[PDB]
């Protein structure tokens, strides 16, 4: 076997029943499922998210957590969010109010700082661990992710009932994050300020640099399996698995990413597949489906240039590989649904592998942020109905790009955008930006 | 200012406001059956069924099938059944309900209808689940009835109880939430639909700790209603110094005109008897509605083979006759009125307390020493200072009384001498060694 | 399936690799393994035993503990023994000297009182927890248990490497015992006397009455598993599992006990098996292999009557079941090897279950003492080589009893013994004795 298949063959794998894997296809279903599982939880609830917002959607979830803990005080309830993101009237201030307005009921909210400054590391670990299940989505908890109030942010939603995996993930969070240096409660009114814990965070980050899941594989490569993965930095096991996964496509590789900004190494893999005669599908958002996109009527801001920069990346990529577009090998899809926003991540390898992850597949995720995933191996095609239904619906709001010219060029962009981008490319800062966002 | 300590107790009870339109009485066990089925079908959020037992008979099957059916049609519906742990795991007096709850769960895979057994004490004789309430969404259908043939008037013979549906978001929440925290998530509660359910001895210590937790578990909520408007006050208690027991004690002396009592087994604790006598002395009226011995479910016709347990109706009659004997003066002044209910071989299971036209206690409480110390009891206290329920209150009392004889003289009740021979011998044996007094404190 | 198999099917079970289960067959190997694991320990050493004796054997172990803590001061070393047993120049006095002669090196020795008086409860919890392994034996730490100096006490010895199980057991000890009321250091010269902590012990014992392992099963009934069990009193989960285990024998049940004194309920089970046509093997010590046995030349003492009382129990049992002896269904073995002593405990159910325990399977263990076990489920026969080798060697020093008459009767006993026993049976105290020892 080639070294790539060998890497995958020798991954530890946890066995998994087909009956214990449930897909959900819409953010509203995901909201309701989360609430349902919170109500019916008996032992533990561990909520890890980038953030939990002080809005109707987020309130819904936090109230459901307090309510479940009131009805079962023995229930082990924990919420972990990003330290920096929660503090920019902030979410952390709101977490404090909630704790005061609900005395007796113990629902701790911890802030995880992955680096001393947000721009240099965020908590992209994903997982709602509820008893023996993991409800895994890229979604944070707010109005749009949960499709409160008529506007939504499209993510993916998988519930996986699996004692062993949930234990591994729950236990990993306990030891490495919750009991880690420089984790600090956000529901404490006296929580430190970032500078005061700066050294704690540095030591913490180093501890995280080689924290990995340790568990023995119980499943061979002829049966349905799941493999949890976690990583921080270039040489994580996750990153290695993502790298080796792509070349194992005997037929076709599919990728979702919100922000098209692939590291060079993943691009090289894509090009190798195309050269070997295989197929590659890439599903990204239209610039208007990006959450930083500012309608052209509203006042333009500096940050509203990001969707344009991601489009420039897509157009440059397509430009170089137009030959493969023409042979129907390379397929690029733009997702767009009025002013809703796109946040799909993942990787499909043929009909056999499905990576579900929080990983945006960009240089940031590759070096700076704490990332994780689950790798589903389905060698018997037992999830085929759901896999196909999920891809069906993902594609439904997509246009296929048949020519790089179908994407707008810098010349077509609004004037303030155009001037900004020309200024940036003059001094070569465009290259730096693509490595930090 | 001033007020007597009894009225003060009632004035300062927390009270939940209640709309007159949201209180529906039902007057017959068959109506109660149909209402229960209707509300099960139309339930949208939750069904919490608490009963002493749910029997493996046509009546009980009807209810359990309707529960499974409603959960099938709405899988998001939160369905729970709670019954007494010990009662569910034995025959009546000679294949248990718990075994049947297991079969049902196996014959209906995918459909999640959990049946929990609540043990109120380590042995049945020392505590049973007399908590009452069918909580369905924002309503409580409150009856003393368990779920079986006679309580539901399946098949032509019935057991008379009382039936009130009260739509009230706050109260139903308080009761649903209290059940969730204190019972369902309590130590020593165990599923009866599990084939591997523990045996009583294995959970004996859990039950002891559970019972102690229950000894001071009470509803906690802020009163939203004054004493000039229609209110409901849920009450719950275990043991002598529960808030329920205190409220029952204080309630009786507030009768400015008349106190009415229903109890199936006439066996009042001495403290409640003393209250009765005080009312009679103050010149007030007291009505007591009990079953004839023949309307008791332990009564064995004199043709059939006599059994030891079939002596209970006689013992309750002896209690009634002793009481009446001492208060015959007040019978004669039309102050004390004792009614015997009797309708062929149907059985009597009315509980409650009316204070004038203003208060109505609906409860599972048999007003006996057992209920006062041993069992987990609850009630709803309806305060109707504006007489808004007067049509229904009066219709209910009308129908209760319909199958009653007034006892004008203690001699109208048979004496021990008149009883069948085996009964007579048993009772004389018991009273010789004074065990009659013990029996009246445990049943 | 019948209620007994159901009980076992629904036990929580931790998965276990066959490579991570090592049997040892001789007390000397056990000594050396313990020393080896103490040297190489990296994180924690938790030694729970009935006692740790002030003799060459015990010194060896305590010195190895001090030495390992000196070389790794971050190592978490704890020793827990029975409070009462350690104080009857005592072991506790010796633990004090050791602590003074080794300043700087922190090796705490805690005394656990299971009841206010020894006769009403002792610490029969067993387990040497070293990092991610448990070395599980019935053995205390002294000359004979460790086969220092030429005379030995036969026990069983299993090393089980398993992160989850060791964590569960380590954590259970931490919370329920070490941090329990009325546990007191024996290396403190000022340790309280029993009467002073009498009330603490009463409350402690009640806390223990429902202390049990709480953990989620990660393993099905088709794979190698281990299930830790712990109990105090009639309705413990251990006792229930022992009760349900015996009827699951489709072929044969094997029992080891040092002191033949089975509770009635376990006897009834045995008789049911015999009636169903199954096989039952019972391996006990000869009276002379009992540690209370006093040679007939030496001065007789009251306590030296116990081996005789256990023999009377065995002879009464066999008497009633001689029919089943004759059909080769019931097999009773007497172990005897010069003046070495017998301390085997356990239960084999067919080839599939192995209970390893400290439980002497007597009324004392059933009500009074704090007991524990590990239940090994081996549905795939992966331990078959080791299981068979262990039973081979256990039986090697055994005689089969073909007739109850082959056991001496009271008439055959020495005169002082005979008089004592007749005195006891006159006033019916024999029945009480069998419930307290």
């Amino acid at each position: 076997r080639n070294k790539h298949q060998q890497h995958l063959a020798q991954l530890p794998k946890i066995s998994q029943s087909v009956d214990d894997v449930d897909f959900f296809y819409a953010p509203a279903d995901f909201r309701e499922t989360l609430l349902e599982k919170i109500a019916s939880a008996k032992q533990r609830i561990c909520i890890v998210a980038l953030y939990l917002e002080q809005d109707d959607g987020g309130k819904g979830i936090l109230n459901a957590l307090y309510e479940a803990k009131r009805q079962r005080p023995e229930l082990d309830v924990r919420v972990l969010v990003d330290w920096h993101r929660a503090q920019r009237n902030t979410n952390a201030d709101w977490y404090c109010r909630m704790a005061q307005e609900n005395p007796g009921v113990d629902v701790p909210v911890y802030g995880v700082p992955i680096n001393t400054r947000e721009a240099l590391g965020v908590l992209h670990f994903k997982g709602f661990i509820i008893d023996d299940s993991v409800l895994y989505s890229g979604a944070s908890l707010n109005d749009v992710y949960l499709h409160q109030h008529d506007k939504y942010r499209y993510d993916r939603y998988h519930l996986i009932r699996n004692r062993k995996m949930s234990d591994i993930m729950f236990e990993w969070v306990t030891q490495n994050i919750m009991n880690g240096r420089g984790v600090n409660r956000l529901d404490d009114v006296n929580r430190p300020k970032s500078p005061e814990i700066k050294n704690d965070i540095r030591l913490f980050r180093q501890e995280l640099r080689d924290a990995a899941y340790h568990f023995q594989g119980d499943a061979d490569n002829d049966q349905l399996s799941v493999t949890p993965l976690v990583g921080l930095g270039k040489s994580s096991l996750l990153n290695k698995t993502i790298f080796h996964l792509m070349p194992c496509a005997e037929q076709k590789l599919t990728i979702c990413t919100p922000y098209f900004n692939l590291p060079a190494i993943l691009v090289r893999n894509i090009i190798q597949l195309l050269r070997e005669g295989k197929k590659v599908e890439i599903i990204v958002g239209d610039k208007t489906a990006n959450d930083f996109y500012i309608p052209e009527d509203e006042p333009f801001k500096i940050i509203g240039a990001l969707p344009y920069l991601y489009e420039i990346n897509l157009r440059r990529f397509l430009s170089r590989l137009q030959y493969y577009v023409n042979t129907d090998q390379l397929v690029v899809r733009l997702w767009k649904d009025d002013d809703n926003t796109y946040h799909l991540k993942g990787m499909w390898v043929d009909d056999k592998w499905m990576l579900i992850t929080g990983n945006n597949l960009n240089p940031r995720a590759w070096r700076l942020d704490l990332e994780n995933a689950i790798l589903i191996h389905d060698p018997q095609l037992e999830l085929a109905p759901q896999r196909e239904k999920e891809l069906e619906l993902i594609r439904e709001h997509t246009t296929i790009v048949k020519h790089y010219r179908d994407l707008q060029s810098i010349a077509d962009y609004p004037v303030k955008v155009r001037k900004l981008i020309r200024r940036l490319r003059r001094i070569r800062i465009d290259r730096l930006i693509s490595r930090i966002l």
Side-chain angles (χ1 to χ4, degrees), chain A residues 58-78:
Chain A
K59 285 173 190 157
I61 303 302
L62 194 53
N63 288 317
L65 289 169
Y66 275 112
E67 187 62 22
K69 177 62 173 188
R70 184 170 296 120
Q71 298 291 324
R72 274 208 259 286
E74 74 280 357
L75 193 65
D76 181 8
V77 179
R78 320 163 165 187

PDB file of all heavy atoms in Angstrom, chain A residues 58-78:
ATOM      1  N   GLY A  58     -28.691  32.260  21.845  1.00  0.00           N
ATOM      2  CA  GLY A  58     -27.770  31.864  22.901  1.00  0.00           C
ATOM      3  C   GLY A  58     -28.453  31.761  24.265  1.00  0.00           C
ATOM      4  O   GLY A  58     -28.168  30.839  25.036  1.00  0.00           O
ATOM      5  N   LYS A  59     -29.344  32.720  24.557  1.00  0.00           N
ATOM      6  CA  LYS A  59     -30.134  32.704  25.782  1.00  0.00           C
ATOM      7  C   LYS A  59     -30.886  31.378  25.877  1.00  0.00           C
ATOM      8  O   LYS A  59     -30.822  30.700  26.900  1.00  0.00           O
ATOM      9  CB  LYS A  59     -31.074  33.917  25.845  1.00  0.00           C
ATOM     10  CG  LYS A  59     -30.390  35.241  26.177  1.00  0.00           C
ATOM     11  CD  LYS A  59     -31.221  36.511  26.087  1.00  0.00           C
ATOM     12  CE  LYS A  59     -30.341  37.731  26.196  1.00  0.00           C
ATOM     13  NZ  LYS A  59     -30.936  38.925  25.596  1.00  0.00           N
ATOM     14  N   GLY A  60     -31.576  31.011  24.789  1.00  0.00           N
ATOM     15  CA  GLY A  60     -32.327  29.770  24.719  1.00  0.00           C
ATOM     16  C   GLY A  60     -31.522  28.593  25.262  1.00  0.00           C
ATOM     17  O   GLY A  60     -32.031  27.787  26.042  1.00  0.00           O
ATOM     18  N   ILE A  61     -30.248  28.532  24.856  1.00  0.00           N
ATOM     19  CA  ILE A  61     -29.396  27.396  25.162  1.00  0.00           C
ATOM     20  C   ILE A  61     -28.958  27.459  26.619  1.00  0.00           C
ATOM     21  O   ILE A  61     -28.990  26.450  27.318  1.00  0.00           O
ATOM     22  CB  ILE A  61     -28.198  27.353  24.198  1.00  0.00           C
ATOM     23  CG1 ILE A  61     -28.662  27.301  22.735  1.00  0.00           C
ATOM     24  CG2 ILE A  61     -27.263  26.188  24.540  1.00  0.00           C
ATOM     25  CD1 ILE A  61     -29.548  26.108  22.406  1.00  0.00           C
ATOM     26  N   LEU A  62     -28.541  28.647  27.067  1.00  0.00           N
ATOM     27  CA  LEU A  62     -28.034  28.805  28.421  1.00  0.00           C
ATOM     28  C   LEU A  62     -29.160  28.574  29.431  1.00  0.00           C
ATOM     29  O   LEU A  62     -28.930  27.970  30.480  1.00  0.00           O
ATOM     30  CB  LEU A  62     -27.395  30.186  28.568  1.00  0.00           C
ATOM     31  CG  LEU A  62     -26.521  30.394  29.810  1.00  0.00           C
ATOM     32  CD1 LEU A  62     -25.439  29.334  29.984  1.00  0.00           C
ATOM     33  CD2 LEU A  62     -25.909  31.783  29.723  1.00  0.00           C
ATOM     34  N   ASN A  63     -30.376  29.040  29.099  1.00  0.00           N
ATOM     35  CA  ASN A  63     -31.539  28.839  29.946  1.00  0.00           C
ATOM     36  C   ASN A  63     -31.878  27.353  30.032  1.00  0.00           C
ATOM     37  O   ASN A  63     -32.254  26.871  31.098  1.00  0.00           O
ATOM     38  CB  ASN A  63     -32.751  29.629  29.465  1.00  0.00           C
ATOM     39  CG  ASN A  63     -32.619  31.114  29.695  1.00  0.00           C
ATOM     40  OD1 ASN A  63     -32.164  31.550  30.758  1.00  0.00           O
ATOM     41  ND2 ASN A  63     -33.022  31.909  28.714  1.00  0.00           N
ATOM     42  N   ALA A  64     -31.749  26.635  28.909  1.00  0.00           N
ATOM     43  CA  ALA A  64     -32.030  25.208  28.883  1.00  0.00           C
ATOM     44  C   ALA A  64     -31.004  24.444  29.719  1.00  0.00           C
ATOM     45  O   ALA A  64     -31.316  23.384  30.252  1.00  0.00           O
ATOM     46  CB  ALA A  64     -32.058  24.709  27.457  1.00  0.00           C
ATOM     47  N   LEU A  65     -29.780  24.984  29.814  1.00  0.00           N
ATOM     48  CA  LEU A  65     -28.719  24.380  30.606  1.00  0.00           C
ATOM     49  C   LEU A  65     -29.004  24.573  32.090  1.00  0.00           C
ATOM     50  O   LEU A  65     -28.906  23.624  32.866  1.00  0.00           O
ATOM     51  CB  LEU A  65     -27.353  24.960  30.238  1.00  0.00           C
ATOM     52  CG  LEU A  65     -26.783  24.565  28.873  1.00  0.00           C
ATOM     53  CD1 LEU A  65     -25.567  25.416  28.544  1.00  0.00           C
ATOM     54  CD2 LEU A  65     -26.441  23.073  28.844  1.00  0.00           C
ATOM     55  N   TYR A  66     -29.337  25.811  32.478  1.00  0.00           N
ATOM     56  CA  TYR A  66     -29.680  26.110  33.860  1.00  0.00           C
ATOM     57  C   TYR A  66     -30.875  25.254  34.269  1.00  0.00           C
ATOM     58  O   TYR A  66     -30.873  24.680  35.353  1.00  0.00           O
ATOM     59  CB  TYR A  66     -29.912  27.607  34.091  1.00  0.00           C
ATOM     60  CG  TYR A  66     -28.640  28.399  34.369  1.00  0.00           C
ATOM     61  CD1 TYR A  66     -28.154  29.340  33.468  1.00  0.00           C
ATOM     62  CD2 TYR A  66     -27.935  28.224  35.553  1.00  0.00           C
ATOM     63  CE1 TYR A  66     -27.005  30.071  33.735  1.00  0.00           C
ATOM     64  CE2 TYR A  66     -26.777  28.936  35.828  1.00  0.00           C
ATOM     65  CZ  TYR A  66     -26.308  29.864  34.916  1.00  0.00           C
ATOM     66  OH  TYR A  66     -25.172  30.577  35.180  1.00  0.00           O
ATOM     67  N   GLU A  67     -31.868  25.133  33.375  1.00  0.00           N
ATOM     68  CA  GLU A  67     -33.094  24.411  33.678  1.00  0.00           C
ATOM     69  C   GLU A  67     -32.805  22.926  33.907  1.00  0.00           C
ATOM     70  O   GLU A  67     -33.376  22.331  34.808  1.00  0.00           O
ATOM     71  CB  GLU A  67     -34.137  24.629  32.580  1.00  0.00           C
ATOM     72  CG  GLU A  67     -35.505  24.039  32.917  1.00  0.00           C
ATOM     73  CD  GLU A  67     -36.181  24.625  34.140  1.00  0.00           C
ATOM     74  OE1 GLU A  67     -35.842  25.760  34.542  1.00  0.00           O
ATOM     75  OE2 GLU A  67     -37.079  23.937  34.664  1.00  0.00           O
ATOM     76  N   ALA A  68     -31.926  22.330  33.096  1.00  0.00           N
ATOM     77  CA  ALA A  68     -31.623  20.910  33.209  1.00  0.00           C
ATOM     78  C   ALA A  68     -30.855  20.622  34.496  1.00  0.00           C
ATOM     79  O   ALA A  68     -31.011  19.548  35.070  1.00  0.00           O
ATOM     80  CB  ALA A  68     -30.852  20.446  31.994  1.00  0.00           C
ATOM     81  N   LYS A  69     -30.028  21.585  34.933  1.00  0.00           N
ATOM     82  CA  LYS A  69     -29.217  21.455  36.137  1.00  0.00           C
ATOM     83  C   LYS A  69     -30.082  21.627  37.385  1.00  0.00           C
ATOM     84  O   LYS A  69     -29.794  21.036  38.423  1.00  0.00           O
ATOM     85  CB  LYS A  69     -28.095  22.500  36.141  1.00  0.00           C
ATOM     86  CG  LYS A  69     -27.187  22.547  37.375  1.00  0.00           C
ATOM     87  CD  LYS A  69     -26.377  21.285  37.638  1.00  0.00           C
ATOM     88  CE  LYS A  69     -25.397  21.477  38.758  1.00  0.00           C
ATOM     89  NZ  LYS A  69     -24.500  20.327  38.883  1.00  0.00           N
ATOM     90  N   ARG A  70     -31.112  22.469  37.282  1.00  0.00           N
ATOM     91  CA  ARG A  70     -32.079  22.648  38.354  1.00  0.00           C
ATOM     92  C   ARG A  70     -32.842  21.342  38.585  1.00  0.00           C
ATOM     93  O   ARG A  70     -33.022  20.927  39.726  1.00  0.00           O
ATOM     94  CB  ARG A  70     -33.005  23.820  38.001  1.00  0.00           C
ATOM     95  CG  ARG A  70     -34.016  24.202  39.070  1.00  0.00           C
ATOM     96  CD  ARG A  70     -34.715  25.512  38.730  1.00  0.00           C
ATOM     97  NE  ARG A  70     -33.794  26.657  38.688  1.00  0.00           N
ATOM     98  CZ  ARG A  70     -33.536  27.467  37.653  1.00  0.00           C
ATOM     99  NH1 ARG A  70     -34.131  27.301  36.487  1.00  0.00           N
ATOM    100  NH2 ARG A  70     -32.665  28.451  37.784  1.00  0.00           N
ATOM    101  N   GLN A  71     -33.263  20.689  37.497  1.00  0.00           N
ATOM    102  CA  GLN A  71     -34.081  19.490  37.588  1.00  0.00           C
ATOM    103  C   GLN A  71     -33.234  18.268  37.939  1.00  0.00           C
ATOM    104  O   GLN A  71     -33.764  17.291  38.454  1.00  0.00           O
ATOM    105  CB  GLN A  71     -34.848  19.229  36.291  1.00  0.00           C
ATOM    106  CG  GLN A  71     -35.828  20.337  35.914  1.00  0.00           C
ATOM    107  CD  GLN A  71     -37.014  20.443  36.848  1.00  0.00           C
ATOM    108  OE1 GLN A  71     -37.510  19.435  37.342  1.00  0.00           O
ATOM    109  NE2 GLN A  71     -37.455  21.657  37.147  1.00  0.00           N
ATOM    110  N   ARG A  72     -31.932  18.309  37.638  1.00  0.00           N
ATOM    111  CA  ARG A  72     -31.027  17.241  38.031  1.00  0.00           C
ATOM    112  C   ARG A  72     -29.733  17.851  38.553  1.00  0.00           C
ATOM    113  O   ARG A  72     -28.763  17.962  37.816  1.00  0.00           O
ATOM    114  CB  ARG A  72     -30.787  16.242  36.887  1.00  0.00           C
ATOM    115  CG  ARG A  72     -31.829  15.143  36.821  1.00  0.00           C
ATOM    116  CD  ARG A  72     -31.327  13.831  36.230  1.00  0.00           C
ATOM    117  NE  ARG A  72     -31.730  13.660  34.837  1.00  0.00           N
ATOM    118  CZ  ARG A  72     -32.939  13.361  34.380  1.00  0.00           C
ATOM    119  NH1 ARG A  72     -33.962  13.332  35.212  1.00  0.00           N
ATOM    120  NH2 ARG A  72     -33.123  13.134  33.091  1.00  0.00           N
ATOM    121  N   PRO A  73     -29.681  18.289  39.829  1.00  0.00           N
ATOM    122  CA  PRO A  73     -28.454  18.863  40.398  1.00  0.00           C
ATOM    123  C   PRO A  73     -27.193  17.992  40.397  1.00  0.00           C
ATOM    124  O   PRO A  73     -26.104  18.507  40.634  1.00  0.00           O
ATOM    125  CB  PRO A  73     -28.887  19.237  41.830  1.00  0.00           C
ATOM    126  CG  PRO A  73     -30.387  19.416  41.738  1.00  0.00           C
ATOM    127  CD  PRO A  73     -30.825  18.347  40.753  1.00  0.00           C
ATOM    128  N   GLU A  74     -27.327  16.683  40.131  1.00  0.00           N
ATOM    129  CA  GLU A  74     -26.178  15.786  40.080  1.00  0.00           C
ATOM    130  C   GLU A  74     -25.539  15.801  38.688  1.00  0.00           C
ATOM    131  O   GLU A  74     -24.457  15.249  38.495  1.00  0.00           O
ATOM    132  CB  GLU A  74     -26.539  14.359  40.508  1.00  0.00           C
ATOM    133  CG  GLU A  74     -27.342  13.547  39.491  1.00  0.00           C
ATOM    134  CD  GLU A  74     -28.839  13.809  39.420  1.00  0.00           C
ATOM    135  OE1 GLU A  74     -29.384  14.623  40.202  1.00  0.00           O
ATOM    136  OE2 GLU A  74     -29.473  13.161  38.562  1.00  0.00           O
ATOM    137  N   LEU A  75     -26.225  16.426  37.725  1.00  0.00           N
ATOM    138  CA  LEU A  75     -25.787  16.522  36.340  1.00  0.00           C
ATOM    139  C   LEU A  75     -24.526  17.378  36.242  1.00  0.00           C
ATOM    140  O   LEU A  75     -24.457  18.442  36.854  1.00  0.00           O
ATOM    141  CB  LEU A  75     -26.955  17.155  35.582  1.00  0.00           C
ATOM    142  CG  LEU A  75     -26.919  17.107  34.056  1.00  0.00           C
ATOM    143  CD1 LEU A  75     -27.004  15.674  33.541  1.00  0.00           C
ATOM    144  CD2 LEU A  75     -28.065  17.934  33.512  1.00  0.00           C
ATOM    145  N   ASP A  76     -23.536  16.900  35.472  1.00  0.00           N
ATOM    146  CA  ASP A  76     -22.253  17.574  35.346  1.00  0.00           C
ATOM    147  C   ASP A  76     -22.259  18.482  34.119  1.00  0.00           C
ATOM    148  O   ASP A  76     -21.976  18.033  33.011  1.00  0.00           O
ATOM    149  CB  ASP A  76     -21.107  16.574  35.300  1.00  0.00           C
ATOM    150  CG  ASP A  76     -19.713  17.177  35.202  1.00  0.00           C
ATOM    151  OD1 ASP A  76     -19.598  18.420  35.317  1.00  0.00           O
ATOM    152  OD2 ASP A  76     -18.755  16.396  35.000  1.00  0.00           O
ATOM    153  N   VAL A  77     -22.538  19.770  34.343  1.00  0.00           N
ATOM    154  CA  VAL A  77     -22.724  20.730  33.271  1.00  0.00           C
ATOM    155  C   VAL A  77     -21.529  21.677  33.225  1.00  0.00           C
ATOM    156  O   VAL A  77     -21.178  22.276  34.239  1.00  0.00           O
ATOM    157  CB  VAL A  77     -24.043  21.499  33.486  1.00  0.00           C
ATOM    158  CG1 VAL A  77     -24.283  22.554  32.407  1.00  0.00           C
ATOM    159  CG2 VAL A  77     -25.230  20.549  33.574  1.00  0.00           C
ATOM    160  N   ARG A  78     -20.928  21.808  32.034  1.00  0.00           N
ATOM    161  CA  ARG A  78     -19.795  22.697  31.803  1.00  0.00           C
ATOM    162  C   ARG A  78     -19.957  23.378  30.449  1.00  0.00           C
ATOM    163  O   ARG A  78     -20.373  22.738  29.491  1.00  0.00           O
ATOM    164  CB  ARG A  78     -18.466  21.933  31.716  1.00  0.00           C
ATOM    165  CG  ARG A  78     -18.264  20.781  32.691  1.00  0.00           C
ATOM    166  CD  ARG A  78     -17.139  19.887  32.209  1.00  0.00           C
ATOM    167  NE  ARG A  78     -16.658  18.969  33.249  1.00  0.00           N
ATOM    168  CZ  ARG A  78     -15.608  18.163  33.148  1.00  0.00           C
ATOM    169  NH1 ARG A  78     -14.926  18.120  32.024  1.00  0.00           N
ATOM    170  NH2 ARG A  78     -15.249  17.405  34.169  1.00  0.00           N
TER     171      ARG A  78
END
